[PDB]
Amino acid sequence: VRGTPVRQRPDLGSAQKGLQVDLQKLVIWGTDVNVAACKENFQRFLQRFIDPLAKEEENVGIDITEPLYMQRLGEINVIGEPFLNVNCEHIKSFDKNLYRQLISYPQEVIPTFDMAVNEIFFDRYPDSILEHQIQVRPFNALKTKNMRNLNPEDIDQLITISGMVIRTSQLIPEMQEAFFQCQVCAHTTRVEMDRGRIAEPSVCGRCHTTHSMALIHNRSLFSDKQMIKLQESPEDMPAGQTPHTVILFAHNDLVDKVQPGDRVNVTGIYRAVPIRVNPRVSNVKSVYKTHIDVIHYRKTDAKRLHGLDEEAEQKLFSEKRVELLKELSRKPDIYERLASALAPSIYEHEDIKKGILLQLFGGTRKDFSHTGRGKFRAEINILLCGDPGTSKSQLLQYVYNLVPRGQYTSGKGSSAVGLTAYVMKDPETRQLVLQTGALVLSDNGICCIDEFDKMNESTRSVLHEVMEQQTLSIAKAGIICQLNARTSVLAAANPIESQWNPKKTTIENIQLPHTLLSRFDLIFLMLDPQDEAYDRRLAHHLVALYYQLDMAVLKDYIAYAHSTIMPRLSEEASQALIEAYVDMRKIGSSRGMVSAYPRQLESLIRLAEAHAKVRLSNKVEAIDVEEAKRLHREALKQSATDPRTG
Amino acid sequence: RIQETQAELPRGSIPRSLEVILRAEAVESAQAGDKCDFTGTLIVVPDVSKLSTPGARAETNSRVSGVDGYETEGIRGLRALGVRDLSYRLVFLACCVAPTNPRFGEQTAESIKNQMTVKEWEKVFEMSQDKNLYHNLCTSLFPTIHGNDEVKRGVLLMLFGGVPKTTGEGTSLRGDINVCIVGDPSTAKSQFLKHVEE
Amino acid sequence: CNTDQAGRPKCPLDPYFIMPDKCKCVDFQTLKLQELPDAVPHGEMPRHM
Ligand SMILES: Nc1ncnc2c1ncn2[C@@H]1O[C@H](COP(=O)(O)OP(=O)(O)O)[C@@H](O)[C@H]1O
Ligand SMILES: [Mg+2]
Ligand SMILES: [Zn+2]
């Protein structure tokens, strides 16, 4: 302590009695924690804990020799943010009993950790100024593979779960310190919140008038709060169990930190609270409901790609990692290496994998506001038109499980309202609220539409606006707005009759309106060549799956590309693009082929920019535009189709 | 009731809508669809919340206990202690109102002339006197779309509109111009519409 | 009658009768104390309590 104001911890709930009980050492009532011992143990953990298996890439700006969290405290000194994220795994490795005490008694233990961190920090720094005393965030607790298995025995304990955010309610203010003024002499007093309630003065302390003191709402002190409806991603999925929605609650710093559709590991206290029979009576129900007072949000995932927030953050890569990635870029076959890395167990779909990689990398974001032109879609859209059993669904699922902010819909399982938005009755505030859809939840990510042909036009019409202007203009009875839907669409289509007739042309087989097909800036025909070598090697691969680049480098490469690569058209690439579009239109003028409109010049620009980004060039080049030409041409099998027939 | 502008939406989010309160002169200074700019102070307003979970009670600090037959238990005790829930909403109190992007620095031509400053008025006058103003406006309004000069001219005439009139018997003579664009895909129809809107 | 929750139909106003046999009674007595005659001033009355 150095005079810093110790801010309250609304996440830890209303303070309890805190009854000390001597066992004859001096535990807290109902627990086996003694404040002195817990504080000393955590102080020791901070002073001297080193991670032996830590990696320079895992920890950036952290020496694997010096104690871990002392450097974190140094960072908190350098910046103003007085928060310290402490790994429950590290605590378990250091002092296992300390970990068990933390997990079983979070409300009691965590304040001791706060005291210890404040003591150490203010001893080291007698002059650093912080708005409030540092606060400790314990995360990475042993993952709860399914909330449905948690039991009343686990209530009020620190758990950790994973899931995507479905909704985030508005900022709810919470009282912390009521302000009272006398209606006679104007005497002012303050009453801090105590155990989840406030005691009215009932008598003036200056004029002694009974009940002359009135509460001043807008002169009181409040704290932020926010309901967050999150959908659980249970690793353990027992038979017959439907998906799970769990109510979260953020407090005063986690409010509005995770948007809908974001996937997060949330560590927090598992609370059970009563249900009033009516919102007006105080009678409660014998059966409680449960929610999560969120202590920590973690975005990083091992099996996914870097999120938007992580990419935005400056210190995401060490200088060594940056140099390694730049070397990998200067490598000449980086494009094919990354394409092969994508979906490692999908056999030689080189062109489709390259297209999906370009989709992941994405073009450049352009600010055409000054031009009065509108908003240009930098995202790339792909349509895999193929016979059932051609692995298009497998590729769709791989992308869905790979990309952050990914949504998945199939066939007639969706609807226009369910994809765009709708109005429901939030069954915790009894208020009517607006719930997004898949196309919005995937706003800055990907939507995977399997069975893209069984999508009766009523809902397929919605995709026009999304794929053209990245906007979803909803004008319903009460709510008018335009939601950002800057998604990338990966769709899978089956030729009519579920089989590709080798007599009808490309368009006649696809059976999708040109208005829509011109939106997709890549269309891959997954067609089966009756080839001995292909069949034999495919059988070898499929059997090999029955008995036996790094994701890390791929993820880091994509993150760095998005972070600091903004390819710009060069003059030579511009002329090449002009010639490419004229030639492509000339070719597409054929009868049954996929005709090329200026949307296809836009598509070529997008693909060239994506390839330049893959190369980290920062300047789109004739090589990139030529590769875009080649990819768009091999897709649809233009080379293998005559300008008359298919 | 106002809602957040599209320029500030976070990813995948629905715009936040809040009610702002105008008092006195500004009472009717905001109209639907306007991109206003409210200046004032945020405030809290007590709420009759339907939350079924009890939270943040407020009660008397005087220690009083009901006697036998009048125990401070149940609704009786809650009322006696004066327990009330402290549930609040966030509401904005705007003292002044003004458009986010002022157009100038009843309605009539003289009113517009007076409202607009000397520089803006002289600019309007000089452009009105300028020749080939038709083509100048079309080009300056659609600087990215190529061709479709007829469509540009028609949209400009639509923007300028006609002169509505009413006949003696009451029947009105519509003066507004209606324009439709039909054509092949990727012909800049949506581009024309978005130009017009922006 | 505060115990109206056992049934929706309500008990009257002023419903309570004292049950005599359930009363813990004690002996009580009233005495009339008079000031001491040697304490009463010369021309005065004896005070009482
Ligand atoms: N004649 C043209 N001049 C300039 N750009 C054009 C022209 N025709 C099409 N485009 C481009 O094609 C893109 C798609 O056109 P779009 O607005 O979808 O037309 P439509 O809505 O009629 O299909 C636009 O972003 C626009 O830049
Ligand atoms: Mg259109
Ligand atoms: Zn007073």
Coordinates of C-alpha atoms and ligand atoms in Angstrom, one line a residue, chain A residues 182-187 204-209 212-213, ligand 3:
Chain A
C182 CA -30.7 15.9 4.3
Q183 CA -34.0 17.5 3.2
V184 CA -33.6 20.1 5.9
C185 CA -30.0 21.2 6.5
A186 CA -28.5 19.6 3.3
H187 CA -26.1 17.5 5.4
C204 CA -29.4 13.3 10.2
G205 CA -26.0 13.6 11.8
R206 CA -26.1 17.4 11.9
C207 CA -29.7 18.5 12.7
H208 CA -30.8 15.1 14.2
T209 CA -34.0 15.2 12.2
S212 CA -34.7 13.8 6.8
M213 CA -31.9 12.1 4.7
Ligands
ZN3 ZN -30.2 17.5 8.7

